[PDB]
């Protein structure tokens, strides 16, 4: 024909008039990655690798089904602490083993919990036995759990 | 839309599948083709000497008018189920001014 | 070459060896360009000065085989239905075939005998009608075109004292369009010359390569969009 | 090709947009260009020097078929209604047809007999009227144009002692415009040659491609707007 | 083409296919350019050397139809009102028509008989008046232009012993202006040639395309503003 | 060279990639180009002016060997099945072979004897049929093509009072396509001249190199895509 | 005055109405036109491509 | 014609001599917005 134009993708840009858009950016992108991840594909558009489910096996090996809606998490060192609502108001402790999460149910009762008041937590490691997780709702008293 | 790109499947190159649609539109036009590649017959998408080249679609309203405007949005995408890593380096657009 | 071959091989030539490197033509556009190319090829290879060899219809074996499948022989029908006015007193109006492109031989069968028709120009008519006798030679008849409505009407000026019993016309038939797909399937009501369906080439395969190459050149010129290219390849439209 | 086709392959060969959101190249402008192209083609093909081959109206079979749909034979009507003044004593004023483009043959039927008309130039009138006899040759008559009002009036200088009974004129009819669509639909009160409705081409299909190519060239050269292109493609307006 | 068609079609050619891409001309400017273009076209197609074909007024059928609606026949009126002084003893001063552009045939009706007038140059007059007899040939008369006031005055030097009873002049009438609107409506007191209202073309439609194209070329040159373009297209002003 | 070789030295002289991971230049496109090259070579070498030496079919030993594998002798079959209309009273319609490219010798065996056929042009038919006798010379017969349907039909105008027994035709057979590989294997329903299988070249090995070089030139010029190259290498398509 | 511009009406393009006046002036001149667009006739404002 | 000039609108500027004005700015504007608001019309003049 007559003319050409080359387009590189340094990022994703919006908010700019179409007449004055910059060819170095993409106007809109779905499920792409421009940084080199798992391969040397930096400054080159590349895919998003998917997720892989991790079974929640109890220490005895049986499956552990989580009750309901999650309100907040907390990773202390390698223990993930979930505060979930549902039929009851539960607390879990998940430790990542090689291929599964060794799930424990630290509590299952009526800690008044609401979905309108999610959880925010701080967790400290004092020693092998005193591993605390302080958490607060916007509604209820501040609480602690070892 | 001349563009370099490569799809892989566990260290195996796949020289037949890169993209599955090309929506091109502006304030008064919108066209789209599936980007098929038939070796013998002409097709929207053709590869040769390791470069892909896709004919930009034509307007849905008439199915004859080319995408003629001062600017235009160019959108490449895959919408068919698949599990490949598709490195997409860059794309040149050939126009007539 | 079937129509499918004309379409597939247009892209081995127009589209940078089927690389989708050039602009990309629909099938309607390819059909239009092929029809125009065949008309151009016929017109150029008819006139000796229109081609590169200086050779016309019957000037070489190749030219004879080129127009072999267009040459048709048909009879003219007396136009006695319409009582029009003729420029010559002894002119019998005859209507020619509808699918007529170029006439190359005409003959009239009179009571006196067959007489080869000479298509006489407007200057020769005035020159030959300024003389005492004002009749053709013993073995010929004249022909001038007259008031024509959606057809071709010819005045046959044969010598007086003679009656016309027949009128044979050998001519080049109008070529049919080249269409590579059912146009109505994707394009609403587009016709090339009034036909919306697949139409093959009614020509000898010898000039199919010529027609395809001319179509490719026309496509490349129409897409380069230069005025200079358009006017340059417009020279060969005649 | 019909009007819809003319528009369609004009779009194909020019790369315009049929949509109205982008105005593109609309139907009025295409009709104007196709008209101008058809008068240009007629003028260039009638004059042998106007084309590339050097062949005029009846200089080859193609040219005979080109003007075939335009040839018309009509009589001249006496202009005795208006008592004007003639430049010759023995001149009978006759009015020519209104839709007249070019006269190629004229003949007058007198009591002495049919006599071919010679359109005599202004120089030859003085030259032949500066002699003793001052009458045409036995089998010819003269013709010089005279005072005309919204028509063409011609003085028929036939030999004295003779009367004119008929005056036949074989002429090339004025081409009708090529109008792709009813202009009044969108374009309020525009016209092309006084017509506003759909006007199919009145010519043989053989020159439809020539007209389309010439119209495309004119479109490209006008859209470019360069003075140089305008002057070069104005040379082919005659 | 009505005036409305000349204006609308100027913009399909001057204004980059009616795209408002070129400068933009008022209707007064378009009228001025059309009038100048028609004067230029008349002057060029009259002189054979002024056009591209080398053909003058009566050198082809096209030229005959071009000037068909300008040719007028009028009588000269004896200029006995003003007792001026003539360069020749036997010269009868005659005034010519006011709307006169170019003379092509003149005749004088004497008691001896009609005599074709030869417009004699100033060199031939001195050459022929250095001889014994000093009279025209038996079938001709001379003509030289004399003192003229706001008109055209001609001395008719016919042979002595003869009286002039008539003087017929066949000439090209001065074309009327081309005006596309009532100029007084928006432009105060501007006239093209003394007329402020809509004025149609008094010419055959055959040269309307020529006039429009010349107007477009003149507009493009006058707006490109180059001295070179102006002097180049000023060549064709004659 | 066989098909595998044609592909292999095409790859060597063009620098394509045999691998399919990079598509490279595939076998269908190479077959198409080799075909087009072989018809181009045949057409250019038959016409003396088409090549660089100025030597035609039988103008040197090389040219005689070039077309040697294409020369075929076959008889024409009477077309009495269809009761069509002939342009001559004494014309017997004969059908020619289907795989016909160019006719170089024709002869008819009559009761009087074998008579060489002269393919008589459309002008010479009128010229020789405007004479008293209107029959060929003693040892020749005429031939003019007539109405043909998906074949070539020829009118054999032999002298009256004679009957036609045989009609031999020595002609150049239509070349078969050069197909490097079975197209149906990968390419669904593509064809080259109605063939899909492997088609070895039917020509002498002497012009195999010419065909390969021409195909390589066409490949390079098409892949370049320049209009100028396409027009220049289209000149050698005839 | 060549210019690109677009008028919308709730996600609907309007290819007929962009501007309604153009006042151009300097120390000694002042002109103004309404910027109408008549498809057939010449007008102060014309759109194409 | 002969020459052209392109005008962008990065803002509204005044107070500068007309001979030395900058084509990138507008001398005076009424009810316009040059920042992208409710649409991606940044550095393009748009309505209020």
Report the length, in residues, of chain D: 238
A and H: touch, per 3+ CB pairs < 8 A?
yes
G12 touches chain B (CB under 8 A): no
**Tell me, what DSSP letter sits at residue F8?**
H
What are D91's strand-pairing partners?
Answer: D157
Question: What's the rounded Cα separation, in Å, for the pair F98 and H3?
Answer: 65
Q: In angstroms, rounded to a whole number, what is the distance separating the alpha carbons of residues D100 and E204?
A: 9
Q: Which residues of G touch E7 (CB under 8 A)?
A: 42
Which member of C22, C52, C68 has the closest CB to residue F238? C52
Query: Within its chain, how far is the Cα of A38 from the centroid?
Result: 20
Q: Taken in order A11, A13, A18, A19, is the CA torsion positive or negative?
A: negative
Chain B contact for G3 (CB, 8 A cutoff)? no
Q: What are phi and psi of B40, to 5 degrees?
A: -85, -45
Inter-chain CB proximity B46 and C17 less than 8 Å: no
Q: How many angstroms separate the CA atoms of E212 and D58, rounded?
A: 29
In C, minimum Cα distance to A2 occurs at C224
- In the DSSP assignment, the letter for residue F207 is G
Which residues 6+ apart lie within 8 Å of E121 measured at CB? Answer: none
- CA separation for the pair D20, B96 (Å, rounded): 21
Asked if residue D171 lies in contact with residue D97, where contact means CB atoms within 8 angstroms, the answer is: yes
Q: Does C228 touch chain A (CB under 8 A)?
A: no
Helix (H, G, I), strand (E, B) or coil at F147: coil
Q: Quick one: resolution in A?
A: 4.4
Beta strands in D10-139 (DSSP E): 71-75, 77-78, 91-95, 100-110, 114-119
Taking contacts as CB-CB distances below 8 angstroms, the residues of chain E near G31 are none
Please state, as a whole number, how many other Cβ atoms lie within 10 Å of the Cβ of residue C184: 12
Report the run of H or E that residue D44 belongs to, with start and end: helix D27-46
DSSP sequence for D158-208: PPTT--EEEEEEEEEEPPPP-BSS-GGGTSSS--SSS--S-B---S-GGGH
Q: Which two tokens stand for residue C161?
A: 């004292």
Rg (CA), chain C: 22
CA distance C7 to B42: 9
A20: left (phi over 0), alpha (psi -120 to 50) or beta: alpha
Q: Taking CB atoms and an 8 Å cutoff, what residues of chain D touch C143? A: none
**Which residue of chain G is at minimal alpha-carbon distance from B29?**
G13
Residues of G in contact with E17 (CB under 8 A): 48
> Is D5 strand, coil or helix?
helix
Helix (H) or strand (E) holding A96: strand A89-96
Q: Which pair of structure tokens corresponds to residue A112?
A: 């008044």
Element of type H or E holding D63: helix D61-66
User: What are the residue ranges of helices labelled H in chain F?
Assistant: 3-14, 27-46, 61-66, 122-128, 208-224, 227-234
Nearest CA in chain B to F190: B40
**Tokens of residue C158, six digits:** 């044969």
Whether chain B has a CB inside 8 Å of the CB on D20: the answer is no
* Torsion, CA F188, CA F190, CA F194, CA F198, rounded to 10: -70
For residue B45, the chain C residues in CB contact (below 8 A) are 20
Contact at CB, D62 and C85, closer than 8 angstroms: no
Q: How many CB atoms lie within 10 A of CB F150?
A: 8
Mapped onto helix, strand or coil, the DSSP state of residue D51 is: coil
**Do the strands E140-145 and C114-119 form a parallel or antiparallel pair, or are they unpaired?**
unpaired
Half-sphere exposure of D53 (CA within 13 A, CB side): 24
H or E element that contains D213: helix D208-224
From chain G, pick out residues whose CB is under 8 angstroms from the CB of B68.
49
Axis-axis angle for helices C27-46, D208-224 (nearest 10): 110
Rounded Cα distance, B10 and D103, in Å: 83
Q: In what order do the strands lie in the sheet with E77-78?
A: E71-75, E164-173, E100-110, E114-119, E140-145, E153-157, E91-95, E77-78
Q: CA F199, CA E64: separation in Å to the nearest integer? A: 66
**Coil, strand or helix: which one is F158?**
coil
Q: CA-to-CA distance for G23 and F211, rounded, in angstroms?
A: 70
G40 touches chain E (CB under 8 A): yes
d(CA B37, CA A7): 23
Q: Look-up: residue for tokens 């003629």? A: B68
| Cβ proximity of C110 and C125 under 8 Å | no
Element (H, E) at D221: helix D208-224
Edge-first strand order for the sheet with A70-72 is A70-72, A79-84, A89-96, A101-109
D85 and B CB contact within 8 Å: no
Beta strands per DSSP E along H1-48? 32-33, 46-47
Verify whether the Cβ–Cβ distance H43 to A17 is below 8 Å.
yes
Strands (DSSP E) found in C76-113: 77-78, 91-95, 100-110
Name the residue among C1, C124, G37 with its Cα closest to residue F191. C1
What does the alpha-carbon distance between residue G8 and residue A38 come to, in Å, rounded to a whole number? Answer: 46
Q: Which helix (H) or strand (E) holds F92?
A: strand F91-95
Enclosing H/E stretch for D6: helix D3-14
Using the Cβ of D228 and the Cβ atoms of chain C, whether some distance falls under 8 Å is answered with no
Locate C84 and state its tokens: 């029009």
Secondary structure, 3-state, chain E: CCHHHHHHHHCCCCCCCCCCCCCCCCHHHHHHHHHHHHHHHHHHHHCHHHCCCCCCCCCCHHHHHHCCCCEEEEECEECCCCCCCCCCCCEEEEECCCCEEEEEEEEEEECCCEEEEEECCHHHHHHHCCCCCCCCCCCEEEEEECCCCCCCEEEEECCCCCCEEEEEEEEEECCCCCECCCHHHHCCCCCCCCCCCCECCCCCHHHHHHHHHHHHHHHHHHHHCCHHHHHHHHHHHC
Q: What are the chain E neighbours of G42 within 8 Å (beta carbons)?
A: 7-8, 11, 15, 18
The sheet that has D114-119: what strands, in order across it?
Answer: D71-75, D164-173, D100-110, D114-119, D140-145, D153-157, D91-95, D77-78
Closest of E221, E82, E88, E61 to residue E149, by C-alpha: E82
Neighbours of D22 (CB within 10 A): 20
Instruction: Please provide the size of chain E in residues.
Output: 238
* Phi, psi (deg, nearest 5) at residue F176: -80, 155
Cα dihedral F211/F212/F216/F219 (nearest 10): 60
Contact E119, E128 (CB under 8 A): no
Judged by CB atoms closer than 8 Å, whether chains meet at D105 and C86 is answered as: no
Q: Which residues share a beta bridge with E232?
A: none
The closest alpha carbon to F179, from F204, F194, F210, F201, belongs to: F201
Question: What is the crossing angle of helices C3-10 and F27-46, to 10°?
Answer: 100
Task: Tell me how long chain C is.
Answer: 238
Query: Are the beta carbons of B73 and B26 closer than 8 angstroms?
Result: yes
Whether the CB-CB separation of D151 and D82 falls below 8 Å is answered with: no
CB D41 within 8 A of CB D191: no
CB contact under 8 A, F24 and B15: no
- How many residues make up chain H in this entry? 48
CA dist D75 and G40 (Å) reads 39
Taking the Cβ of residue D160 and every Cβ of chain E, the question of whether any pair is shorter than 8 Å is answered with no
Asked if A45's CB is within 8 angstroms of B87's CB, the reply is yes
Lookup: tokens for C188: 């609403």
Residue F137 CB partners (closer than 8 Å, separation 6+)? none
Number of residues written out for chain G: 49
Q: Please give the backbone phi and psi of residue D46, each rounded to the nearest 5 degrees, phi first.
A: -70, -50
Nearest to F32 by CA among F174, F169, F178: F178
- Residues H46 and H33: beta-carbon distance below 8 Å: yes
Tell the residue number behind the tokens 């045939």, with chain if given: E105
Question: Is C60 at the interface with chain F, CB within 8 A?
Answer: yes
d(CA E221, CA H1): 10
Q: Where are the alpha helices (DSSP H) in chain C?
A: 3-10, 27-46, 61-66, 122-128, 183-186, 208-224, 227-234
Nearest CA-CA partner of D195 in D177, D173, D181: D177
Task: Return the ∠ at Cα F8 (arms to F2 and F14), rounded to 5°.
Answer: 130
Q: How many angstroms separate the CA of residue D226 from the nearest CA in chain B?
A: 17
Closest residue in chain H to residue E220, using alpha carbons only: H1
Whole-angstrom Cα distance, residue A104 to residue A58?
A: 6
Please classify residue E205 by burial: count the beta carbons closer than 10 Å to its beta carbon, then call 0-12 exposed, 13-18 middle and 19+ buried: middle
| B97 in G contact zone (CB under 8 Å) | no
Name which of C219, C233, C234 is nearest C23 in CA terms. Answer: C219
Cα separation of the two ends of chain G: 15
Q: How crowded is the C-beta side of F216, counted as CA atoms within 13 Å? A: 17
G30 at D interface, C-beta within 8 A: no
Structure tokens at A75: 């990773």
Tell if the CB–CB gap between B65 and D18 is shorter than 8 Å: yes
Cβ-Cβ contacts under 8 Å, B96 against chain A: 1-3
CB contact under 8 A, G41 and D20: no
* Contact residues, chain C, for A2 at CB < 8 Å: 224-225
Distance CA H36, CA A77 (A): 45
Give me the phi and psi of E218, to 5 degrees please.
-60, -40
Radius of gyration of chain A (CA): 23
Method: cryo-EM
Contacting residues for D199 by C-beta, under 8 A, at least 6 apart? D3, D176, D177, D178, D179, D192
Taking the mean position of all CA atoms in its chain, how far away is CA A101? 15
Region of residue F219 (left: phi > 0; alpha: psi -120 to 50; beta: else): alpha
* Residue contact F22–B38, C-beta within 8 A: no
Give φ, ψ of H31 to 5 degrees: 50, 60
Across the interface, whether the CB atoms of B15 and F28 are under 8 A apart is answered: no
CB contact under 8 A, D19 and B69: no
Task: Tell which of F23, F180, F186, F190 to mutate to test the B interface (max B CBs under 10 Å).
Answer: F23
CA distance, residue C177 to nearest chain D CA (Å): 11
Is B50 an 8 Å CB contact of chain C? no
Residues F166, F34 contacting (CB under 8 angstroms) = no
Angle between helices D208-224 and D227-234 (to 10 degrees): 150
Backbone angles phi, psi at C116, to 5 degrees: -70, 130
Dist. CA F190–CA F194, nearest whole Å:
9
Q: Which long-range contacts (CB under 8 A, 24 or more apart) does C145-149 make?
A: C145/D64, C145/D67, C145/D68, C145/D71, C146/C84, C146/C86, C146/C87, C146/C91, C146/C93, C146/D71, C146/D73, C146/D170, C147/C84, C147/C85, C147/D71, C147/D72, C147/D73, C147/D74, C148/D68, C148/D69, C148/D71, C149/C82
Q: For strand B73-77 and strand B85-92, is the pairing parallel, antiparallel, or unpaired?
A: unpaired
Are A86 and A108 contacting, i.e. CB atoms less than 8 angstroms apart?
Answer: no
Helices F227-234 and C208-224 pack at an angle, to 10 degrees, of 160
Contact F94, F77 (CB under 8 A): yes
On the 0-12 / 13-18 / 19+ scale of CB atoms within 10 A, E121 is: exposed
Contacts with A85 (C-beta within 8 Å, 6 or more apart), sequence order = A67, A68, A69, A71, A113, A114, A115
Strand, helix or coil for residue A120: strand
* G15 interface with B at CB cutoff 8 Å: yes
SS3 for E211-232 is HHHHHHHHHHHHHHCCHHHHHH
- Owner of token pair 């709702």: A137
* Inter-chain residue contact F222 with C4, CB threshold 8 Å: no
Cβ within 8 Å, pair H44-A20 = yes
Q: What share of chain C is helix, strand, coil (3-state, %, to 5)?
A: 35, 20, 45
C-alpha pair distances (Å), A129 with each of A92, A126, F24:
17, 8, 68
How far is residue E56's CA from residue E63's CA, in Å, rounded to a whole number?
Answer: 7
What does the H/E/C string look like for C153-167? EEEEECCCCCCEEEE
How far is residue D177's CA from residue D193's CA, in Å, rounded to a whole number? 7
Cα F203 from Cα F65, distance rounded (Å): 10
Do residue C223 and residue A2 have CB atoms under 8 angstroms apart?
A: no
Collapsed DSSP state (helix, strand, coil) of residue F220: helix
3-state secondary structure of G19: coil
Beta bridge partners of E105: E170
The SS3 of residue B65 is coil
Q: Which of E205, E194, E168 is nearest to E72 (CA)?
A: E168
Pairing of β C100-110 and β E91-95: unpaired
């Amino acid at each position: 024909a007559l003319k050409k134009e080359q387009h590189f993708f340094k990022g994703m840009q919006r908010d700019l008039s179409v007449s004055k858009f910059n060819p170095e950016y993409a106007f809109d992108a779905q499920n792409i990655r421009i940084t080199a991840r798992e391969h040397d594909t930096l400054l080159s558009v590349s895919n998003e690798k998917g997720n892989k489910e991790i079974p929640l096996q109890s220490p005895s090996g049986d499956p552990v089904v989580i009750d309901g809606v999650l309100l907040g998490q907390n990773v202390l060192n390698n223990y993930v602490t979930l505060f979930t609502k549902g039929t009851n108001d539960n607390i879990y402790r998940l430790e990542n083993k090689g291929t599964y999460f060794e799930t424990l149910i630290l509590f299952s009762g009526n800690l008044n919990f609401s979905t309108d008041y999610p959880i925010e937590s701080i967790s400290v490691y004092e020693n092998n036995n005193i591993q605390k997780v302080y958490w607060v709702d916007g509604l209820n008293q501040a609480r602690v759990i070892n | 839309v001349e563009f370099r790109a490569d799809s892989w499947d566990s260290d195996n190159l796949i020289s037949n599948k890169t993209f599955d649609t090309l929506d091109v539109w502006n304030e008064y036009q919108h066209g789209t083709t599936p980007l098929t590649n038939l070796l013998g017959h002409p097709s929207p998408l053709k590869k040769k000497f390791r470069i892909w080249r896709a004919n930009i679609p034509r307007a849905i309203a008439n199915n004859r008018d080319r995408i003629r405007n001062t600017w235009a949005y160019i959108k490449l995408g895959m919408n068919t189920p698949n599990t490949y890593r598709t490195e997409f380096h860059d794309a040149i657009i050939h126009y007539f001014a | 070459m079937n129509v499918n071959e004309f379409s597939n091989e247009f892209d081995v030539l127009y589209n940078n060896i089927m690389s989708n490197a050039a602009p990309g033509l629909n099938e309607y556009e390819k059909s239009v360009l092929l029809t125009k190319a065949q008309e151009e090829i016929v017109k150029n290879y008819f006139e000796p000065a229109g081609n590169k060899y200086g050779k016309g219809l019957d000037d070489s074996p190749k030219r004879q085989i080129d127009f072999s499948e267009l040459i048709k022989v048909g009879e003219g029908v007396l136009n006695t239905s319409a009582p029009t006015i003729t420029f010559d007193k002894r002119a019998k109006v005859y209507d020619l075939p509808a699918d007529l492109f170029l006439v190359i031989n005409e003959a009239v069968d009179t009571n006196a005998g067959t007489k080869q028709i000479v298509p006489i120009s407007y200057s020769d008519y005035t020159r030959l009608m300024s003389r005492p006798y004002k009749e053709p030679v013993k073995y010929q008849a004249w022909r001038i075109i007259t008031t024509s409505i959606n057809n071709i009407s010819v005045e046959l000026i044969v010598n007086s004292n003679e009656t016309i019993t027949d009128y044979k016309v050998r001519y080049i038939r109008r070529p049919a369009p080249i269409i590579t797909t059912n146009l109505s399937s994707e394009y609403g009501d587009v016709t090339i010359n009034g036909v919306s369906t697949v139409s093959e080439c009614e020509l000898n395969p010898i000039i199919h390569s010529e027609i395809l190459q001319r179509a490719v050149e026309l496509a490349k010129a129409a897409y380069q969009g230069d005025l200079q290219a358009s006017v340059e390849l417009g020279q060969r439209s005649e």
